[PDB]
Design a protein around this ligand. Structure first.
Ligand SMILES: Nc1nc2c(ncn2[C@@H]2O[C@H](COP(=O)(O)OP(=O)(O)O)[C@@H](O)[C@H]2O)c(=O)[nH]1
Ligand SMILES: Nc1nc2c(ncn2[C@@H]2O[C@H](COP(=O)(O)OP(=O)(O)O)[C@@H](O)[C@H]2O)c(=O)[nH]1
Ligand SMILES: [Mg+2]
Ligand SMILES: [Mg+2]
Lengths: 246, 246
């Protein structure tokens, strides 16, 4: 009815499948929800998918053809393209009968960013919203913050869909960490400022870069989520609905 | 002696291992050369590596512990971190006894961009040069060009190493294709110009972005290489040496 699509994008250990699971249940209180799994090499799902590409191809079976692991992943998404139109249509249909279609993407994001299947699928859905989750562990140095927010800018460019930067597993944060990440993230002044202290080509090649005063809506609002405590779920829901309007 | 390190970074089908192989042989005419393989899930190497992390861990063996393919790749680079110092030192030593250390990276670049092993290793080598190869197939639309050159900008930010944008397998190009890619790439005027024709949020969110007039050395020189004809090898060699100076 409301027909929103939310695509979770992240690398290994970001926890996006658990998030897709739990954020669904959260939504299943006030909304009809659909689950789509595009990962051909995930062992188990904590939700019940209306679409599961493992039903057509899996990485493990393909490897049992003599493919290397890197080669079976790529080859698994080559075979999916034979069922491109089907899935696009499976998805478009689901989107007509639901408030939310949650799309769980390949564990290796480059399989989604670089392969025809993921790229073309995206191109052909109406205004999908993308949520890019990062493992807060990566957030050790000041450049790490600029990168996260640049990567989300690309995903946007590559998939042509608004992309929301998010940290997940924030329940594991000491709260000092919690303190530290927000500062760099929300206080654009703080971040840029700090980037000068680096006397290095990367402290120097990395400062002119966080040009917030650029683009349009230069700065993006970073969500902090937790599958575990349902932190930030209402923000995301508010962000979905609001993207659906604008 | 000259001690240069060249790190090949690219996704599946970009051909970087074949490139690392052949560009070595090309160098093995006028130089001493070392090969380092950081990919724990590659089936076979066309070169003789002085360092091979498959000798310590492989993705396939790890999966035979009940790990999913996505989970065995990540777990393979977690175990490598136990031998971090060793490899750093293996590498630093090789770099002292050779003109060139060629570093062949994990087939999935995010394993290199997001995992501690790849990120920390990079941080700890002297001014390595990174070569980001893309499959020219991805080069279908005008935004595809901006993205390639943005991704290389990140790799730079993430790894803190100068990153050279390259197309590979250019021998497969019809020459019309060859015509088309260079125009978008080298003629900065052409590219930006074209990006306006898009009346879309992505033709609109994708134009203010290719800000060449920004950064420092805003525009980067894109190499066109071929393992097959040795196209562009002299450019790269010229680019290595020149990065070694500057
Ligand atoms: N503490 C905590 N753990 C989480 C959270 N989200 C996921 N996890 C755990 O992280 C691990 C990886 O999650 P998963 O969603 O399967 O990873 P994915 O491959 O990115 O989809 C699982 O053991 C989850 O239980 C979270 O918000 N908080
Ligand atoms: N025509 C052509 N084929 C190439 C070139 N480089 C690699 N290949 C082929 O592309 C395939 C994948 O190459 P490989 O280096 O193993 O892929 P990688 O996983 O990115 O390292 C192999 O069959 C190579 O023979 C090239 O420059 N030209
Ligand atoms: Mg998963
Ligand atoms: Mg390879």
């Amino acid at each position: 009815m409301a027909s929103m699509i939310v695509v979770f994008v992240g690398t290994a250990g970001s926890g996006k499948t658990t998030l897709t699971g739990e954020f669904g249940r959260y939504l299943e209180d006030n909304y009809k929800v659909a689950y789509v799994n595009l990962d051909t090499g995930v062992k188990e799902l904590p939700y019940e998918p209306s679409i599961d590409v493992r039903e057509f191809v899996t990485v493990e079976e393909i490897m049992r053809e003599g493919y290397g692991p890197n080669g079976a992943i790529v080859e698994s998404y080559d075979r999916l393209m034979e069922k491109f139109n089907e899935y696009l249509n499976k998805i478009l249909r689901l989107e007509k009968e639901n408030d939310y279609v949650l799309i769980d993407t390949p564990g290796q994001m480059e399989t989604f960013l670089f392969h025809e299947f993921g790229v073309r699928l995206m191109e052909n859905l109406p205004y999908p919203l993308v949520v890019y989750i990062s493992d807060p562990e990566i957030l050790k140095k000041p450049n790490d913050y600029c990168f996260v927010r640049f990567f989300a800018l690309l995903i946007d460019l590559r998939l042509g869909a608004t992309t929301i930067p998010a940290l997940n597993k924030v329940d594991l944060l000491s709260e000092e960490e919690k303190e530290r990440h927000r500062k760099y993230f929300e206080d654009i002044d703080y971040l840029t400022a700090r980037l000068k202290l680096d006397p290095s080509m990367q402290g120097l090649m990395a400062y002119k870069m966080c040009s917030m005063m650029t683009e349009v809506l230069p700065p993006v609002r970073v969500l902090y989520l937790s599958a575990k405590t349902r932190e930030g779920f209402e923000d995301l829901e508010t962000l979905a609905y609001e993207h659906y309007c604008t």
